[PDB]
Amino acid sequence: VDKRREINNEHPLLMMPLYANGEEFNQGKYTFWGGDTLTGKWENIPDDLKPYTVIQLHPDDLPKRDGAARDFYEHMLEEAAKYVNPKTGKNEPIPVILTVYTAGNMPYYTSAHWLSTSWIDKMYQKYPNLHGIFSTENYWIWANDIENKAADYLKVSAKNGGYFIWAEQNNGSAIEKAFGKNGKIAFQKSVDKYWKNLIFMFKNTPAAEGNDSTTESYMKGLWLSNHTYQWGGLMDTWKWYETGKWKLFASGNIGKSQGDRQWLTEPESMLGEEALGVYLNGGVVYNFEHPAYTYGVNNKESLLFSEVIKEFFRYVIAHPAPSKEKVLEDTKVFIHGDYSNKGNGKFFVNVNTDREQTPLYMTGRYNVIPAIPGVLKTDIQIKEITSPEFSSTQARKEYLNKLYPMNYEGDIFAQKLDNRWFVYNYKVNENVKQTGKLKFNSLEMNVEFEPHTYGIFERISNGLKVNLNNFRTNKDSLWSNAQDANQAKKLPQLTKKGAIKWIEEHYIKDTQFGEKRVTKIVLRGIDKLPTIHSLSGTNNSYDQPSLNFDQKNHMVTITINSNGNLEFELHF
Ligand SMILES: CC(=O)N[C@H]1[C@@H](O[C@H]2[C@@H](O)[C@@H](CO)O[C@@H](O)[C@@H]2O[C@@H]2O[C@@H](C)[C@@H](O)[C@@H](O)[C@@H]2O)O[C@H](CO)[C@H](O)[C@@H]1O
């Protein structure tokens, strides 16, 4: 059946979440938390991005009873279906994805429980603008018939030419079980027929359990082995709450005690560092939480959205991610087996991650090593997870080091694609500068990055194109009146409503921008003083870069002082 949309490297997808306000629904009003509206939100999306963005409805705290989610969803599907573009005056139905399964669809957790497969089929038939359905976050409540239900969602989507999109994390072997590890094989068999209509994403919310790397490995491997059409990630600023962090760089752990302050605190640019792990490995679907901080409120873009996500998403449209063909050519090792039997996220710590609790990598040398669970058949060295090479940290590196050569110097994350070096500082909550030395041919480039900074350096015919992002606003005001972790833990709760109000009042406006901070780029093998061209970036966020040319040493030091996004070319 003809696909309702394309999702691939040239046609990536940004999911745009809208969360139902259940309190207001009880009063007969149809509204979203944060005050976005379906029509206003769509209208605000830049026209260039509209072909690649889909509205994702989520039932959030709708009443947990029959009829509530169906009622709210039908209301919104009608709004989407009859939208009129005014400019054009033409009816242009808004593309929609419905959230249909979450928290195991337990009747004590979600109104989505009372959305039948029969109702889903009827919606797809009624609304050509319904492009897919979404299951999200079930690892902690792995319902008895989850795999059976997932098979039904995939089939009903394939029947109608829509996509079934599942965002899940390998906590408690979730991804392995989905494909039949524990004998529940309905979904495995569904995928054998309908993988062209499946999108599989990570969901990095449960940061305390450290399953980021293994989940992403699986996502990439399932894609490479034709067990999902495309893959991606849902990146979640609640990870800061899950790991008990508070004020940026501060000592002490406050555990899960200040939720609504905590999901605001993750550095804006760190979401781009996370998203790079998707792009660089051929993933093409992106989604974020908490929506109020990552997207915005009241139909306006937050600064995280405008300065990081929108720029990054424009980048992956203009430079499509590597194709399956290409990723597959580049893969030297493919793992077959269950990470859950080999320490789960611990498998990669001190291989390509610096700690158990991180969504980042410490080296791009192996990029992301792809895997599929042991229940799947295979169907490049394909290596069983139980083989001697994987028995320990050192063994893993020895084996991988023969097949993936060292291709840069320095304690920093860097990965190369064609003429481009992608670089970031991998520290999460420690204020440590990092440095690296990268080579194009010939041209040798050193960089020094503070934490929460990524750059893309592209060798061009007359020099170097640079895109830099270190956007990080000051969140200290949220942690005012707390001199240590003990005092922070006891602050009055910000609350969900208070945090939305803080965003309106102190983020969307009256922003406490962060201090400008220094990045250095050193070019070696240089004949003359390079010149800077096409300089642009976040408004009022950067000084004019400074150059220092040592003619005898064929080298130039470029000093940038900034806090935001930035782009320019050097000609030489
Ligand atoms: C109780 C609450 O504050 N709920 C809002 C909050 O929900 C997320 C957090 O509570 C997070 C803590 O790490 O746990 C996540 O489970 C939860 O996500 C929401 O619930 C799960 C089961 C899934 O359905 C998710 O899609 C959903 O977001 O933050 C979200 C927005 O990030 C909402 O405001 C919740 O109402």
Coordinates of C-alpha atoms and ligand atoms in Angstrom, one line a residue:
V1 CA 0.0 0.0 0.0
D2 CA 1.4 3.5 -0.9
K3 CA 3.3 5.2 2.0
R4 CA 1.6 8.3 3.3
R5 CA 5.0 10.0 3.6
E6 CA 8.6 9.4 3.0
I7 CA 11.0 9.0 6.0
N8 CA 14.6 8.7 5.1
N9 CA 18.0 10.5 4.9
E10 CA 16.8 13.0 2.3
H11 CA 13.3 13.2 4.0
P12 CA 14.1 13.2 7.7
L13 CA 11.3 13.7 10.4
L14 CA 11.0 16.0 13.3
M15 CA 8.2 15.0 15.6
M16 CA 6.4 18.0 17.2
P17 CA 4.7 16.9 20.5
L18 CA 1.4 18.5 21.8
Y19 CA 0.3 17.2 25.2
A20 CA -3.4 17.1 26.1
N21 CA -4.5 19.1 29.2
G22 CA -6.8 16.6 31.1
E23 CA -8.1 19.1 33.7
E24 CA -9.3 21.4 30.9
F25 CA -10.9 18.4 29.0
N26 CA -13.0 17.7 32.1
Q27 CA -14.3 21.3 31.7
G28 CA -15.2 20.7 28.0
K29 CA -12.2 22.6 26.7
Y30 CA -9.6 21.1 24.2
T31 CA -6.2 22.5 25.0
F32 CA -2.5 21.5 25.4
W33 CA -0.1 22.0 28.3
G34 CA 2.0 25.0 27.6
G35 CA -0.7 26.8 25.7
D36 CA 0.3 25.8 22.1
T37 CA -2.7 25.2 19.8
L38 CA -2.7 22.7 17.0
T39 CA -3.2 25.4 14.3
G40 CA -0.9 28.1 15.7
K41 CA 1.9 25.6 16.3
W42 CA 1.7 24.3 12.7
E43 CA 1.6 27.9 11.4
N44 CA 4.6 28.9 13.4
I45 CA 6.7 26.1 12.0
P46 CA 9.1 27.6 9.4
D47 CA 7.8 26.9 6.0
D48 CA 11.1 25.2 4.9
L49 CA 10.7 22.7 7.8
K50 CA 7.0 21.9 7.3
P51 CA 7.7 19.1 4.7
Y52 CA 9.8 17.3 7.4
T53 CA 7.7 18.0 10.6
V54 CA 4.6 16.1 11.9
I55 CA 2.4 17.0 14.8
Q56 CA 2.5 14.3 17.5
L57 CA -0.5 14.3 19.8
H58 CA 0.0 12.8 23.3
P59 CA -3.0 12.2 25.7
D60 CA -0.8 13.1 28.8
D61 CA -3.2 13.5 31.7
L62 CA -6.6 13.0 30.0
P63 CA -9.1 11.3 32.3
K64 CA -8.2 7.5 32.6
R65 CA -11.5 6.2 31.3
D66 CA -13.2 5.2 28.0
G67 CA -13.9 7.8 25.5
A68 CA -11.6 10.6 26.8
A69 CA -8.7 10.0 24.4
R70 CA -11.0 9.1 21.4
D71 CA -12.9 12.4 22.0
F72 CA -9.8 14.6 22.3
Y73 CA -8.1 12.9 19.3
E74 CA -11.1 13.1 17.0
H75 CA -11.5 16.8 17.9
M76 CA -7.9 17.5 17.0
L77 CA -7.9 15.3 13.8
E78 CA -10.8 17.4 12.6
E79 CA -8.9 20.7 13.3
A80 CA -5.9 19.3 11.5
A81 CA -7.9 18.0 8.5
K82 CA -9.7 21.3 7.9
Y83 CA -6.9 23.7 8.4
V84 CA -6.8 26.5 5.8
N85 CA -3.5 28.2 4.8
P86 CA -4.1 31.9 4.9
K87 CA -1.9 33.0 2.7
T88 CA -2.9 30.6 0.0
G89 CA -6.5 30.2 1.1
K90 CA -6.2 26.4 0.3
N91 CA -7.2 23.6 2.7
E92 CA -3.9 22.1 3.6
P93 CA -4.5 19.2 6.1
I94 CA -1.9 19.2 8.9
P95 CA 0.1 15.9 9.1
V96 CA -0.5 14.1 12.5
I97 CA 0.9 11.2 14.5
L98 CA -1.2 9.8 17.4
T99 CA 0.3 8.5 20.7
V100 CA -1.5 5.2 21.1
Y101 CA 0.5 3.1 23.6
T102 CA 2.5 4.2 26.6
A103 CA 3.2 3.0 30.2
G104 CA 2.0 -0.5 29.1
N105 CA -1.4 1.0 28.4
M106 CA -2.3 0.2 32.0
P107 CA -5.7 1.7 32.9
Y108 CA -4.1 3.2 36.1
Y109 CA -1.4 5.0 33.9
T110 CA -3.0 6.3 30.6
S111 CA -6.2 7.2 28.8
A112 CA -4.5 5.6 25.8
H113 CA -5.7 2.2 27.2
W114 CA -9.1 2.9 25.6
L115 CA -7.9 3.3 22.0
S116 CA -8.8 0.1 20.1
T117 CA -7.0 -1.1 17.0
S118 CA -10.5 -1.0 15.4
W119 CA -10.7 2.8 16.2
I120 CA -7.2 3.3 14.9
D121 CA -8.1 1.6 11.5
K122 CA -11.2 3.9 11.3
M123 CA -9.1 7.0 11.9
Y124 CA -6.5 6.1 9.2
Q125 CA -9.4 5.5 6.7
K126 CA -11.1 8.8 7.7
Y127 CA -7.9 11.0 7.8
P128 CA -5.4 10.9 5.0
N129 CA -3.3 13.4 7.1
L130 CA -2.9 10.7 9.8
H131 CA 0.6 9.5 8.9
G132 CA 1.4 7.2 11.8
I133 CA 0.9 6.0 15.4
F134 CA 3.4 6.1 18.3
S135 CA 4.3 3.8 21.2
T136 CA 6.6 5.4 23.9
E137 CA 8.2 4.4 27.2
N138 CA 7.1 0.9 28.3
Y139 CA 10.4 -0.6 29.6
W140 CA 9.4 -0.1 33.3
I141 CA 5.9 -1.7 32.8
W142 CA 6.4 -4.4 30.2
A143 CA 2.7 -5.5 29.8
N144 CA 2.0 -9.2 29.2
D145 CA 0.6 -8.6 25.6
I146 CA 2.9 -5.7 24.6
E147 CA 4.5 -7.6 21.7
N148 CA 1.1 -8.9 20.5
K149 CA -0.3 -5.3 20.6
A150 CA 2.8 -3.9 18.8
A151 CA 2.3 -6.5 16.0
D152 CA -1.3 -5.2 15.7
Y153 CA -0.2 -1.6 15.5
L154 CA 2.4 -2.4 12.8
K155 CA -0.1 -4.4 10.7
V156 CA -2.8 -1.8 11.0
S157 CA -0.3 0.9 10.0
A158 CA 1.0 -1.2 7.0
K159 CA -2.6 -1.8 6.0
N160 CA -3.2 1.9 5.6
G161 CA 0.3 3.0 4.5
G162 CA 1.1 4.8 7.8
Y163 CA 4.1 4.2 10.1
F164 CA 4.2 2.5 13.5
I165 CA 6.8 4.5 15.5
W166 CA 8.1 2.9 18.7
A167 CA 10.5 4.9 21.1
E168 CA 11.9 2.4 23.7
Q169 CA 15.0 1.9 25.9
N170 CA 16.7 -1.4 26.6
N171 CA 16.0 -1.2 30.4
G172 CA 15.2 -4.8 31.6
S173 CA 16.0 -6.2 28.2
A174 CA 13.1 -4.3 26.5
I175 CA 14.4 -4.3 22.9
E176 CA 15.5 -8.0 23.2
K177 CA 12.1 -9.1 24.5
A178 CA 10.2 -7.0 21.8
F179 CA 11.8 -9.3 19.2
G180 CA 11.1 -12.5 21.1
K181 CA 13.9 -13.2 23.6
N182 CA 11.5 -14.5 26.2
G183 CA 9.3 -16.4 23.7
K184 CA 6.9 -13.7 22.7
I185 CA 7.4 -13.6 19.0
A186 CA 4.3 -11.9 17.5
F187 CA 6.2 -8.7 16.8
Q188 CA 9.2 -10.5 15.4
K189 CA 6.9 -12.2 12.8
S190 CA 5.0 -8.9 12.2
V191 CA 8.3 -7.2 11.4
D192 CA 9.3 -10.0 8.9
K193 CA 6.4 -8.8 6.8
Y194 CA 6.0 -5.1 7.7
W195 CA 9.4 -3.7 8.5
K196 CA 9.0 -1.1 5.7
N197 CA 6.3 0.6 7.9
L198 CA 8.3 0.5 11.2
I199 CA 10.3 3.3 12.8
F200 CA 12.3 2.3 15.9
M201 CA 13.8 5.0 18.2
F202 CA 15.7 5.1 21.5
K203 CA 14.2 6.9 24.4
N204 CA 16.9 8.2 26.7
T205 CA 14.8 9.3 29.7
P206 CA 16.0 6.5 32.1
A207 CA 19.6 7.9 32.4
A208 CA 20.3 6.3 35.8
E209 CA 20.3 2.8 34.2
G210 CA 22.9 3.6 31.6
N211 CA 21.4 1.8 28.6
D212 CA 22.0 4.7 26.1
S213 CA 24.8 3.1 24.1
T214 CA 23.3 -0.4 23.9
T215 CA 19.9 0.8 22.9
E216 CA 21.3 3.0 20.2
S217 CA 23.5 0.1 19.0
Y218 CA 20.4 -2.0 18.6
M219 CA 18.5 0.8 16.8
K220 CA 21.3 1.1 14.3
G221 CA 21.7 -2.7 13.9
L222 CA 17.9 -3.4 13.4
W223 CA 18.0 -0.8 10.7
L224 CA 21.1 -2.2 8.9
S225 CA 19.5 -5.7 9.0
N226 CA 16.1 -4.7 7.6
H227 CA 14.3 -5.1 10.9
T228 CA 13.0 -1.4 10.8
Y229 CA 12.6 1.0 7.9
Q230 CA 14.5 3.9 9.6
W231 CA 15.6 4.7 13.2
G232 CA 16.1 7.6 15.5
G233 CA 16.0 8.9 19.1
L234 CA 13.9 10.7 21.6
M235 CA 16.2 12.9 23.7
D236 CA 14.9 13.9 27.0
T237 CA 16.0 16.7 29.4
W238 CA 14.4 14.7 32.3
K239 CA 17.7 12.7 32.2
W240 CA 19.0 15.5 34.6
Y241 CA 16.3 14.6 37.1
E242 CA 16.8 10.8 36.7
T243 CA 20.5 11.1 37.6
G244 CA 19.8 13.6 40.5
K245 CA 21.9 16.6 39.1
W246 CA 21.1 20.2 40.0
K247 CA 22.9 23.5 39.4
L248 CA 25.3 23.2 36.4
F249 CA 28.7 21.9 37.6
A250 CA 27.7 22.0 41.3
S251 CA 28.9 19.3 43.8
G252 CA 26.4 16.9 45.4
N253 CA 23.4 14.7 44.2
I254 CA 19.8 15.7 45.0
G255 CA 18.2 12.5 43.6
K256 CA 14.7 12.8 42.2
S257 CA 13.6 15.8 44.3
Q258 CA 13.2 18.9 42.1
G259 CA 11.8 17.5 38.9
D260 CA 10.6 20.8 37.3
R261 CA 13.8 22.7 38.0
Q262 CA 15.9 19.6 36.9
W263 CA 14.3 19.1 33.4
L264 CA 15.1 22.8 32.7
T265 CA 18.8 22.6 33.5
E266 CA 20.5 20.4 30.8
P267 CA 22.6 22.7 28.6
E268 CA 20.8 23.6 25.3
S269 CA 23.8 22.6 23.1
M270 CA 24.1 19.2 24.8
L271 CA 20.8 18.2 23.0
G272 CA 22.7 18.8 19.7
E273 CA 25.6 16.6 21.0
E274 CA 23.0 13.8 21.6
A275 CA 21.3 14.4 18.2
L276 CA 24.7 14.0 16.5
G277 CA 24.8 10.4 17.6
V278 CA 21.6 9.8 15.6
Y279 CA 22.7 11.7 12.4
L280 CA 26.3 10.4 12.3
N281 CA 25.0 6.8 12.3
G282 CA 22.3 7.2 9.7
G283 CA 19.3 7.8 12.0
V284 CA 16.7 10.2 10.6
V285 CA 13.9 10.7 13.2
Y286 CA 14.1 13.1 16.1
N287 CA 11.8 13.8 19.1
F288 CA 12.4 15.6 22.4
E289 CA 11.1 16.0 26.0
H290 CA 10.3 18.1 28.1
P291 CA 8.4 19.8 25.2
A292 CA 8.1 23.2 27.0
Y293 CA 11.8 23.7 27.1
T294 CA 12.8 21.8 23.9
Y295 CA 10.1 23.2 21.6
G296 CA 8.4 26.1 23.4
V297 CA 5.2 27.4 24.8
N298 CA 2.3 29.5 23.5
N299 CA 3.1 28.7 19.9
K300 CA 6.5 30.4 20.2
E301 CA 9.9 28.7 19.8
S302 CA 12.0 28.4 22.9
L303 CA 15.7 29.4 22.5
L304 CA 16.8 25.7 22.7
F305 CA 14.5 25.1 19.7
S306 CA 15.5 28.2 17.7
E307 CA 19.3 28.2 18.5
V308 CA 20.0 24.4 18.6
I309 CA 17.3 22.0 17.3
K310 CA 16.1 24.1 14.4
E311 CA 19.7 24.7 13.2
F312 CA 20.7 21.1 13.7
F313 CA 17.5 19.9 11.8
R314 CA 18.1 22.3 9.0
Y315 CA 21.7 20.9 8.8
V316 CA 20.5 17.3 8.4
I317 CA 18.0 18.3 5.6
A318 CA 20.8 20.2 3.7
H319 CA 23.3 17.4 4.3
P320 CA 21.4 14.1 4.4
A321 CA 22.6 11.5 6.9
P322 CA 24.7 8.7 5.5
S323 CA 22.6 6.2 3.6
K324 CA 22.1 2.6 4.7
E325 CA 24.4 1.6 1.8
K326 CA 27.1 3.8 3.1
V327 CA 26.8 3.1 6.8
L328 CA 26.9 -0.6 5.9
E329 CA 30.1 -0.2 3.8
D330 CA 31.7 1.6 6.8
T331 CA 30.7 -1.0 9.4
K332 CA 33.6 -3.3 10.3
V333 CA 32.0 -5.2 13.3
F334 CA 28.3 -6.2 13.7
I335 CA 27.4 -7.7 17.1
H336 CA 24.8 -10.5 17.4
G337 CA 23.6 -11.1 20.9
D338 CA 22.0 -9.8 24.1
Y339 CA 23.6 -6.8 25.8
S340 CA 21.6 -7.6 28.9
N341 CA 23.8 -10.7 29.4
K342 CA 27.0 -8.7 29.1
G343 CA 26.3 -5.8 31.6
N344 CA 24.0 -3.8 29.2
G345 CA 25.4 -0.1 29.0
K346 CA 28.5 -1.2 30.9
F347 CA 29.6 -3.1 27.7
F348 CA 30.8 0.2 26.2
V349 CA 32.1 2.1 29.2
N350 CA 35.9 2.8 28.6
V351 CA 35.4 1.5 25.1
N352 CA 33.6 4.5 23.6
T353 CA 31.7 6.0 26.6
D354 CA 33.3 7.7 29.6
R355 CA 30.8 6.5 32.3
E356 CA 27.7 4.5 32.8
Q357 CA 25.3 7.5 33.0
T358 CA 25.8 9.5 29.8
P359 CA 24.0 10.0 26.4
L360 CA 27.4 11.0 24.8
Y361 CA 30.5 9.2 23.4
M362 CA 34.2 9.7 24.2
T363 CA 35.6 8.7 20.8
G364 CA 34.1 8.4 17.3
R365 CA 36.8 5.8 16.3
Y366 CA 34.3 2.9 16.2
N367 CA 31.3 5.3 15.6
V368 CA 28.3 3.3 17.0
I369 CA 28.9 -0.5 16.7
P370 CA 25.7 -2.0 15.4
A371 CA 24.0 -5.0 17.0
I372 CA 20.8 -7.1 16.9
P373 CA 19.4 -9.3 19.8
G374 CA 20.3 -13.0 19.9
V375 CA 16.7 -14.1 19.0
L376 CA 17.1 -12.6 15.5
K377 CA 18.9 -14.5 12.7
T378 CA 21.9 -13.2 10.7
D379 CA 20.6 -13.0 7.8
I380 CA 32.1 -7.0 8.0
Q381 CA 32.6 -9.5 10.8
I382 CA 29.3 -10.6 12.4
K383 CA 30.5 -11.5 15.9
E384 CA 28.5 -13.3 18.6
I385 CA 28.4 -11.3 21.8
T386 CA 29.8 -14.3 23.7
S387 CA 32.9 -14.5 21.6
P388 CA 36.3 -14.1 23.5
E389 CA 36.9 -10.6 21.9
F390 CA 34.0 -9.2 23.9
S391 CA 34.7 -10.9 27.2
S392 CA 36.2 -7.8 28.8
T393 CA 36.9 -4.0 28.3
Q394 CA 40.5 -4.5 27.1
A395 CA 39.6 -7.4 24.8
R396 CA 36.8 -5.2 23.2
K397 CA 39.4 -2.5 22.4
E398 CA 42.2 -4.8 21.2
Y399 CA 39.8 -6.4 18.7
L400 CA 38.1 -3.2 17.7
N401 CA 41.5 -1.3 17.4
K402 CA 42.6 -3.8 14.6
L403 CA 39.5 -3.1 12.5
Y404 CA 39.0 0.6 13.2
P405 CA 42.2 2.6 12.9
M406 CA 42.9 5.6 15.1
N407 CA 42.0 8.6 12.9
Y408 CA 42.6 11.6 15.1
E409 CA 44.6 12.6 18.3
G410 CA 43.3 14.0 21.6
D411 CA 41.0 13.2 24.5
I412 CA 37.8 14.6 22.8
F413 CA 34.9 13.2 20.7
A414 CA 35.5 13.4 17.0
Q415 CA 34.1 11.5 14.0
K416 CA 34.8 12.1 10.3
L417 CA 32.3 11.8 7.4
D418 CA 33.6 12.6 3.8
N419 CA 35.2 16.1 4.1
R420 CA 33.8 17.0 7.5
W421 CA 35.1 16.6 11.0
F422 CA 32.3 16.5 13.7
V423 CA 33.7 17.3 17.2
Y424 CA 32.3 17.8 20.7
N425 CA 33.5 18.0 24.3
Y426 CA 32.0 14.8 26.0
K427 CA 31.9 16.1 29.6
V428 CA 28.4 16.1 31.1
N429 CA 28.5 18.0 34.4
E430 CA 32.3 18.7 34.9
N431 CA 33.9 21.9 33.8
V432 CA 36.9 20.5 31.8
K433 CA 38.3 21.8 28.5
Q434 CA 39.2 19.2 25.8
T435 CA 41.5 19.3 22.8
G436 CA 42.0 17.4 19.6
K437 CA 44.1 17.3 16.4
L438 CA 42.2 16.6 13.2
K439 CA 43.6 16.2 9.7
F440 CA 41.9 16.8 6.4
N441 CA 44.8 16.1 4.1
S442 CA 47.5 18.0 4.5
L443 CA 45.6 20.6 6.6
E444 CA 46.1 20.0 10.3
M445 CA 43.6 21.6 12.7
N446 CA 43.7 21.6 16.5
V447 CA 40.6 22.6 18.5
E448 CA 40.0 23.4 22.2
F449 CA 36.3 23.1 23.4
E450 CA 34.7 23.9 26.7
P451 CA 31.9 21.4 27.8
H452 CA 28.6 21.6 25.8
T453 CA 30.2 22.6 22.6
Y454 CA 30.1 20.9 19.2
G455 CA 31.5 21.9 15.8
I456 CA 31.4 20.8 12.2
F457 CA 34.5 21.6 10.2
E458 CA 34.1 21.1 6.4
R459 CA 37.2 21.3 4.1
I460 CA 36.1 23.4 1.1
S461 CA 37.9 24.3 -2.2
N462 CA 39.2 27.6 -0.9
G463 CA 39.5 26.8 2.9
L464 CA 37.3 25.7 5.8
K465 CA 33.5 26.1 6.5
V466 CA 32.8 26.2 10.3
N467 CA 29.5 25.6 12.2
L468 CA 29.9 25.9 15.9
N469 CA 27.3 25.5 18.7
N470 CA 27.9 26.2 22.4
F471 CA 24.6 27.7 23.3
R472 CA 24.1 27.5 27.0
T473 CA 21.9 30.0 29.0
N474 CA 22.4 30.5 32.7
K475 CA 20.1 28.3 34.8
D476 CA 21.6 29.4 38.2
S477 CA 18.5 31.6 39.0
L478 CA 16.4 28.3 39.3
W479 CA 18.9 27.2 41.9
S480 CA 19.0 30.5 43.9
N481 CA 18.9 30.4 47.7
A482 CA 20.7 27.0 47.7
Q483 CA 24.3 26.9 48.7
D484 CA 24.7 23.1 48.6
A485 CA 22.8 19.9 47.5
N486 CA 21.1 19.6 50.9
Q487 CA 19.6 23.1 50.6
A488 CA 18.7 22.6 46.9
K489 CA 16.8 19.4 47.6
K490 CA 14.6 21.4 50.1
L491 CA 13.8 24.3 47.8
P492 CA 10.0 24.9 47.3
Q493 CA 8.8 22.8 44.3
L494 CA 8.7 24.7 41.1
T495 CA 5.7 22.5 39.9
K496 CA 4.6 21.7 36.3
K497 CA 2.5 24.9 36.1
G498 CA 5.3 27.0 37.8
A499 CA 7.8 25.7 35.3
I500 CA 5.6 26.6 32.3
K501 CA 5.2 30.0 33.9
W502 CA 9.0 30.3 34.4
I503 CA 9.5 29.6 30.7
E504 CA 6.9 32.2 29.6
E505 CA 8.4 34.9 32.0
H506 CA 12.1 34.2 32.2
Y507 CA 13.1 32.1 29.2
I508 CA 10.9 33.2 26.2
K509 CA 11.6 36.7 27.5
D510 CA 13.9 38.3 30.1
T511 CA 16.4 35.5 29.3
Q512 CA 19.5 35.1 31.5
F513 CA 21.9 34.5 28.6
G514 CA 25.1 32.6 29.6
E515 CA 28.6 34.2 29.5
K516 CA 30.5 34.3 26.2
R517 CA 33.3 31.6 26.4
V518 CA 36.3 30.8 24.4
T519 CA 36.9 28.2 21.6
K520 CA 40.3 28.0 19.9
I521 CA 41.0 26.6 16.4
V522 CA 44.6 26.3 15.3
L523 CA 45.5 25.7 11.7
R524 CA 48.9 24.2 10.8
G525 CA 50.6 24.1 7.3
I526 CA 49.4 27.6 6.5
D527 CA 51.1 30.0 3.9
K528 CA 49.3 33.3 4.6
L529 CA 46.8 34.9 6.9
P530 CA 43.4 33.4 6.3
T531 CA 40.4 35.7 5.9
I532 CA 37.0 35.2 7.5
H533 CA 33.8 35.3 5.4
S534 CA 30.0 34.9 5.8
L535 CA 30.1 35.4 9.5
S536 CA 26.6 34.9 11.2
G537 CA 25.2 33.4 14.4
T538 CA 22.9 33.9 17.3
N539 CA 22.0 37.6 17.7
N540 CA 24.4 39.5 20.1
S541 CA 26.2 36.3 21.1
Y542 CA 29.7 36.5 19.6
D543 CA 32.7 38.9 19.3
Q544 CA 34.4 39.3 16.0
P545 CA 36.9 36.3 15.9
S546 CA 40.5 37.1 16.6
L547 CA 43.4 35.8 14.4
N548 CA 47.1 35.4 15.4
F549 CA 49.3 34.3 12.5
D550 CA 52.8 32.9 13.1
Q551 CA 54.2 33.1 9.6
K552 CA 57.4 31.1 10.3
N553 CA 55.4 28.2 11.9
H554 CA 52.9 28.1 9.1
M555 CA 50.1 28.4 11.7
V556 CA 47.2 30.6 12.7
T557 CA 45.3 30.7 16.0
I558 CA 41.7 31.7 15.8
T559 CA 40.1 32.8 19.1
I560 CA 36.2 32.8 19.3
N561 CA 34.4 34.3 22.2
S562 CA 30.7 33.3 22.1
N563 CA 27.6 31.6 23.5
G564 CA 25.1 30.5 20.7
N565 CA 25.3 29.1 17.2
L566 CA 27.9 30.4 14.8
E567 CA 29.0 29.9 11.2
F568 CA 31.7 31.3 8.9
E569 CA 34.2 30.3 6.2
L570 CA 38.0 30.7 6.4
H571 CA 39.6 31.4 3.0
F572 CA 43.3 30.4 2.5
Ligands
LIG1 C1 4.1 13.4 36.8 C2 4.6 14.4 35.7 O1 5.2 15.4 36.0 N1 4.3 14.0 34.4 C3 4.8 14.9 33.3 C4 6.2 14.6 32.9 O2 6.3 13.2 32.7 C5 7.5 12.5 32.5 C6 8.3 12.5 33.8 O3 7.5 12.3 35.0 C7 9.5 11.5 33.7 C8 10.4 11.4 34.9 O4 11.7 10.9 34.4 O5 8.9 10.2 33.6 C9 8.3 10.0 32.3 O6 7.8 8.7 32.5 C10 7.1 11.0 32.1 O7 6.9 11.0 30.7 C11 5.5 11.0 30.4 O8 5.0 9.8 30.8 C12 5.5 8.6 30.1 C13 4.9 7.3 30.8 C14 5.3 8.7 28.6 O9 4.0 8.6 28.2 C15 5.9 10.0 28.1 O10 5.6 10.1 26.7 C16 5.3 11.2 28.9 O11 6.0 12.3 28.5 O12 6.8 15.3 31.8 C17 5.9 15.2 30.6 C18 6.6 16.1 29.5 O13 8.0 15.8 29.4 C19 4.5 15.6 30.9 O14 4.4 17.0 31.2 C20 3.9 14.7 32.1 O15 2.6 15.1 32.4

